[PDB]
């Protein structure tokens, strides 16, 4: 990603260093009175909301490169009581305080625009997710996430398009789709297996009917088409 | 809202003037090859999409002041095949081309931040709406959504929190399963009709089932939030 690399160089130029986080660590948390701008350069994370009764809600998933900000750029106050938890084994992020961000993005407008469009990708992603769910329910959400994962991490193998992710637990799949119950997800994931849309052969998932996923996750497909056309065109 | 006034003054002081749109008109549409930055100064609108059936899908509602951009600021291409339809009888909006927008934001970064932070609020709104739905399903979405409408348009009266909105625009804003959830709220005296108006009489019920959108409004609009808490 060119825009993400040039932004990386820009941060290091201005002294900001990368920080290594291991699985289950929180890059930022919902109790910190200080808010940050996280430039997730490598790895996978998820946005959570730990309610008072201890229940963890999974709201969004991110992979580097991307930008996740915990506070409003103007007021510097919380946009929501969320945490950014690492779910890959390791992750690499640049932690920035918001006040420092405004200064940096004011010296270079090109990178300001890079951060600006990451928020736009978020807005349209959520709506797209909500669109597919409204049409095809949980099936649309699951097919949508699997499709996106196939665009990003898919590779050609004799047994279909292999999703090249370590520890892609079937429960990790049911959260980005918007389901907290492992049984209701197990139902759809099994049906997909029975209809041979996917196959779990040795460690990883294999997509076999890619057209099937495009059929029930159309708006998330149109989102990836409009947002990442180069990667989209690899399997279209 | 002072932040929007300065932006208006800023847009006008640089020549950009507003247009007037009318109910059922599209400020932008999913077929135009040119993308725009809409500065919705007044009125109420909805974002719509269309699947390959001719079906209309209501995705999002916006009230002025606010900003709705149809294309990415860097590439200027679509973010999604969306239309911006006017819900209110009339609406006032400034229609800017993304290319023209940039050179404008580049010369007064204070108003760039206003637009930036406006995307932040839209992002957080979607997550809170999704959070409530994941906890209380359609019930949680309806409540959350009525809760915000109460915070924005409500005023305390002897009959409760009156929604100072056209009874027309109200019904335009309120599917069979949804119609029965709303009517059940009416039947249970959460929101009540009286004297040609609607009043919210059990605000706590809405807060109870729209908690994460209730926090969103407190974090995004703490001024208005305090008027009723
Ligand atoms: Na925080
Ligand atoms: Na458009």
Residue numbers in the entry:
A (entry chain B): 2 to 237
B (entry chain A): 2 to 175, 183 to 237
Paper excerpt:
The major regulator of virulence factors in L. monocytogenes is the transcription activator PrfA, a member of the Crp/Fnr family of regulators. PrfAWT is a homodimer in which each monomer consists of an N-terminal domain (residues 1 to 108) and a C-terminal DNA-binding domain (residues 138 to 237) linked by a long α-helix (αC, residues 109 to 137). Two α-helices in the C-terminal domain, αE (residues 170 to 178) and αF (residues 183 to 197), constitute the two helices of the typical HTH motif present in many prokaryotic transcription factors. Glutathione binding stabilizes the DNA-binding helix-turn-helix (HTH) motif in a conformation compatible with DNA-binding, thereby allowing expression of PrfA-regulated virulence factors.
In addition, we found three new PrfA mutants in the remaining three strains—Leu to His substitution at residue 140 (PrfAL140H), Ala to Gly substitution at residue 218 (PrfAA218G), and Ala to Val substitution at residue 94 (PrfAA94V). All the previously identified PrfA* mutants, i.e., PrfAG145S, PrfAG145C, and PrfAL140F, could grow in this medium with G-6-P, as could the PrfA mutants PrfAL140H and PrfAA218G, whereas the strain carrying the PrfAA94V mutation was unable to grow. The PrfAG145S, PrfAG145C, and PrfAL140F mutants showed the highest expression levels, followed by PrfAA218G and PrfAL140H. To gain a deeper understanding of the PrfA* mutant proteins, the crystal structures of purified PrfAL140H, PrfAL140F, and PrfAA218G were determined as individual proteins and in complex with the PrfA hly promoter DNA. We expected that the crystal structures of PrfAL140H, PrfAL140F, and PrfAA218G would be similar to the PrfAG145S structure, since our in vivo characterization classified them as PrfA* mutations. However, their structures showed that each of the PrfA* variants had only one folded HTH motif, with the remaining structure residing in the PrfAWT conformation. The PrfAL140H, PrfAL140F, and PrfAA218G PrfA* mutants all had a folded HTH motif in one monomer of the homodimer but an uncollapsed central core structure. Consequently, we suggest that these mutant structures represent an intermediately activated form of the protein with features characteristic of both inactive and activated PrfA. The most striking structural difference between the inactive, intermediate-active, and fully active structures is the position of their recognition helices. When superimposed on monomer B, the recognition helix in monomer A is shifted up to 6 Å.
